[PDB]
Amino acid sequence: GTSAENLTAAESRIRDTDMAAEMMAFTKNNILTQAAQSMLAQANQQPQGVLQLLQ
């Protein structure tokens, strides 16, 4: 029983994930995704030099 509990703890620490750290990373990546979305929406509008030609 003692050995099984100790090895279970070891295997948990090796393979299982901490919820808090992954939550942090996921929120960070979502915020970065939104930022890149807005930046791309701006960059698509940036090349508008049609007022050179017409008037």
Binding site: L32, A35, A36, M39, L40, Q42, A43, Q46
Partner: protein
Amino acid sequence: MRIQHNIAALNTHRNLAANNAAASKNLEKLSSGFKINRAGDDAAGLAISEKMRGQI
């Protein structure tokens, strides 16, 4: 002097190109989320960042 060359428009074109380049650099820095994407951005600080990443 009058027709064949229009120097004001040349200067304006230069400044326009420079402003566009600066805006593109800012877009790169905002989309990437990092202030140093190339070594031309900052040489002393790229190395420090890499060593610190290794240590972390």
